Amino acid sequence: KKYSIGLDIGTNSVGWAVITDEYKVPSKKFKVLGNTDRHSIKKNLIGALLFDSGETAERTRLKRTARRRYTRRKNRICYLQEIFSNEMAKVDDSFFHRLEESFLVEEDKKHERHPIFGNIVDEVAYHEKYPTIYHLRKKLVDSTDKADLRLIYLALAHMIKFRGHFLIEGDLNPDNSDVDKLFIQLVQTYNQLFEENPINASGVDAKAILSARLSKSRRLENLIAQLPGEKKNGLFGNLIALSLGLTPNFKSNFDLAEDAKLQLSKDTYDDDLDNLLAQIGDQYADLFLAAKNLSDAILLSDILRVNTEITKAPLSASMIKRYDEHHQDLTLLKALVRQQLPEKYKEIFFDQSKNGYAGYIDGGASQEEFYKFIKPILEKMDGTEELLVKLNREDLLRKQRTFDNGSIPHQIHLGELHAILRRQEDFYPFLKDNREKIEKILTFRIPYYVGPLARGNSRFAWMTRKSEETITPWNFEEVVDKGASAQSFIERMTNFDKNLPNEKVLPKHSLLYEYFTVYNELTKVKYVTEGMRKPAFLSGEQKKAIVDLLFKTNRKVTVKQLKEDYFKKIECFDSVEISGVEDRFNASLGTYHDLLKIIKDKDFLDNEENEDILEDIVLTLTLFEDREMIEERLKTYAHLFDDKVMKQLKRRRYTGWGRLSRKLINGIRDKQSGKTILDFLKSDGFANRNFMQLIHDDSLTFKEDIQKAQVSGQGDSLHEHIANLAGSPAIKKGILQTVKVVDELVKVMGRHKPENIVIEMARQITKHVAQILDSRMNTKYDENDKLIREVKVITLKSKLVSDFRKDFQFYKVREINNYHHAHDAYLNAVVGTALIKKYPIMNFFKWDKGRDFATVRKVLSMPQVNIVKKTEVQTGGFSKESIRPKRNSDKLIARKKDWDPKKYGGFLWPTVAYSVLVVAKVEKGKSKKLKSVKELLGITIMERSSFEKNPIDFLEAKGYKEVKKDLIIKLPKYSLFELENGRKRMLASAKQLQKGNELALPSKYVNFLYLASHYEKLKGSPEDNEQKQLFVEQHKHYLDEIIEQISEFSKRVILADANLDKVLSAYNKHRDKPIREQAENIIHLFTLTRLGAPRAFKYFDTTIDPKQYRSTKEVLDATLIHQSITGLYETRIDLSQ
DNA sequence: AAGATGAGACGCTACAGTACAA
RNA sequence: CUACUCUGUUGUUUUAGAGCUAGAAAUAGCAAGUUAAAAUAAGGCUAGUCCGUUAUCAACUUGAAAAAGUGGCACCGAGUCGGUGCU
DNA sequence: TTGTACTGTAGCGTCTCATCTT
């Protein structure tokens, strides 16, 4: 007999169903492996796999880069100690040794407890002389006297370890670091983008306004007041507030559907900016970048407040002044609270839990929380005018290591490091010998294009070596082949075109790409001028003319400029209405105007044989963000132009990639027409042809050749094909599990294949699913070259299946039980066969109209549907990530080997990888005798490697003895057990279970509950609504029988009898409620019965506190069930042994 | 009438903590 | 529409920064507080300025591993699958 | 000594909704 398969693909589930030609589902007798007596069972061939959503690589990449950063910083410290080592050993033998073991408690610290000097007296003198590191730093910059080599090392190591940012490249100069120059660049960019309505911001004194020691909103209002034409809630006002560090809302400027709630200080700023630019386009990206640069300058001015130039170290002197302010205001607050409000003195300065100063220094209170707490207190006192104004300025009692330090460039630390290396240069000869070496330790940065410095073992690295020497910051210029590593970087980072997988995607700012966008916008353009009767798209001569006069002249072409500067100017048209476009084009020749601004030679850009050159420079500036490699790749065009245009062109950067490849836009050519895509866009293209049209064209040769290219190369083996596919990894998990359930269903059906497999995806991706099945499913060949397609593969829309449900009263209810995925799988199987047998269009359902509707109603009414919860070994972090203080608890996990956690504190809440059933012996508590024992042991992700190497030694280290090795069973999460009377429990961890059963509530109750749920919103005809509503009111005895279904089901498999007493009482108190209201409270009620974790739910008077099943002992003698991915094949292990 | 801030509660759900029971 | 490369700032934990006056302590009065080190998944061997939280994983048999195999069909019922005939 | 019911605690941070200011 022949059979067909239907599927329901989801982000958390795969529905699957087997159908006969007669539209019945088969039910078959299955063999059981394992030691139980129940050798054979009956199952229906319909069910659904359930699993957790697939996680992204994002978190893993963050932790990976953090690990790399930590390793590299520790290596920098190692390099500095290696330089200092010999002379340090001449000065102090155990200095670095005392430094590395500073963490350990004194009882197992081998050296003296005092890190720097080793004696208490010199430590007291040091801490009194320099209460902060910045006092030492300013001394070491501004003193010519000889200093101790230890303090030299502390200053240099503090600079190198915390070295500041590299966003400014080259030397620190006012063109890229002062507030006035980047304010001028911001307003020049703003006037360049908004050519109409510019701002005459050149009259403003930006340094006096933005660098003023004034409250930040009041500073914003000061800058707005100097600019009469624009306001605070204008766009420019919002970028100024954003650059100051407020949280403006660009929704007011771009009329977006959602808040553009940007703020630079938040860690997730960048993502919010990409979501904003995904809406408003990429024209504005560099504008927000300029605002970010201005913010870096502003906040740097708020740190480096010592502009008096008497010192050589501005940062050190600024932090010393900040400490002095903190000390003075600390004394003044102590005095003022002591004399005016004595009742709160101990609350502020001693109670470190309660958000005061003691909470702000000794506790966990942030600066924002401290200002939240202390500001109302300051308003209640005398003399606090000086202090509250500093709080308004955010300048009161400031710490030195704060969030604002992220704007400090590495050139500032480099300058202070250079000052100390110069001041003590003659006193210590090895600083004179190793000045450039230490400076290179600070200044060296691994480029983007080099990647990790692996020796071939890493998955992520690509660089190529000129020598097998170990890489250091000093030999990097000669060990890594920078050219070859750069070439490998280009090879790896180039995305392939989804439409043409052999070809690389063009850069986003490619000139060819910009022409494609402009001509695509303009073939869609159509217009009526006053001299003609009916609209037409612009001709190719017209298209060329508008591009030449307008798009090659202005960065933002708009319909007004069309009408005045082309149609009246050239075509002599009195008036034109251009129906086919927006008021202003989003597409632009932006990069052309950029390069025209840089190199100032329009004829060089119009000269067509230069096109390879400009595409190469645009590709270079898009790929690389390191100035040296940009110089290297631009060497080949130093002869085309030279001096200022080169020096300025080297500074330009671009971001992102286009949608399409060169071979697609202006490569492939129609055999009939002799035109490319770009030719059809640029010419008339018959009457009209958009890019999308050109692609989805039946006449054009493109549609067949692009498919013939798309099936090639991308048709890899299964897993690597899934990795290449487009989508978030949850749907990738779904598709791969889909392929596996198809493989096991064709495994189970006598190795006979189906004839139809039907897909629904809850999109382009579904065609690749069909291709995956097409290439997996057919491998035979006949004599000639043609392929054979022996199974039909069909795609169904969800909307039509939903209409099938609602028309014939096959109403889905998604939350009574998990059978629905299998039920839509059966439904699109039915329609997928029906469609292809009717038409080798839904109206012929309104096929045997008597028998087949009864058959599908019977199939939906069936209570045995194969739910399979995918058992998964858990992966992720070892525990919750916070580090907790010392305690007398055995539960804490140590952070290193030697660090006994009761001394040092550690992590908590570890995550179990899988549980293991162990049969062994254990010492009886009141004796030493070995009692035989059987139990579940939890294996956390940390211990997984040690157990999975050698189980026996791990179990004996856990304390077990005489372990029966063959009896140990790997039990992942959601391992399934069957308890008494058909009760089922799933293993969530070694200490907790979850309920497994589902209430297969009969279809009459499902239809009743659906119609009662939507009782006022059925949306049918009034006859249809009346007929539906009269069903509920004549079966209203159901809202007792539904309660006495859940009562019986709970009394059988949900042992929470105290809760059942509560709700049945709560039901009886509230039986009087209206029909829909009680019906949705029963919809809420099935949470007690539902598969998964026990979870709270709401009823009329009370929320029912769920009974957690917090003990796993009752499964240790049950029938453990191993289930195949379809759940059809099983292995049942009776643990009563 | 629109944006900022402030925080009740939605509670994911498994695993400390404690008292408690044989 | 995934994926990847670089870097910075915080936060957390333990120690160092001698607390001082009373009192047998318990506990009160007074002062003091801004920083530094080290760690930031335990760790691993290929000893790399690398890797370690993504994807993948029912069981059994054979294999170090990638991986191959392992489970009769109708009929009739449907409280999570059961019953009957053939084999 | 030894297996139980109850809080609240994380990685929190939205889902929710109310008032003050412009």
Residue numbers in the entry: 3 to 764, 925 to 1002, 1042 to 1047, 1074 to 1364
How did the manuscript describe this experimental structure?
CRISPR-Cas9 is a powerful tool for genome editing, but the strict requirement for an NGG protospacer-adjacent motif (PAM) sequence immediately next to the DNA target limits the number of editable genes. Recently developed Cas9 variants have been engineered with relaxed PAM requirements, including SpG-Cas9 (SpG) and the nearly PAM-less SpRY-Cas9 (SpRY). Here, we combine structural and biochemical approaches to determine how SpRY interrogates DNA and recognizes target sites. Here, we show that SpRY binds diverse PAM sequences by forming non-specific interactions with the phosphodiester backbone of the target DNA.
Based on our kinetic data, we prepared cryo-EM samples 1 min after mixing SpRY:gRNA with NAC PAM DNA. Since SpRY lacks a PAM requirement to bind DNA targets, it must instead identify targets through probing for sequence complementarity to the gRNA. The 0 bp structure reveals that SpRY interrogates DNA targets by introducing a ~50° kink in the center of the target duplex, distorting the phosphodiester backbone immediately adjacent to the 3’ end of the gRNA spacer. Interestingly, we did not observe an open protein/linear DNA conformation, suggesting that this conformation may be too transient to capture or a product of crosslinking. While the 0 bp and 2 bp structures largely resemble the Cas9 binary complex (RMSD 1.88 Å), the transition to the 3 bp structure requires the seismic eviction of the REC2 domain.
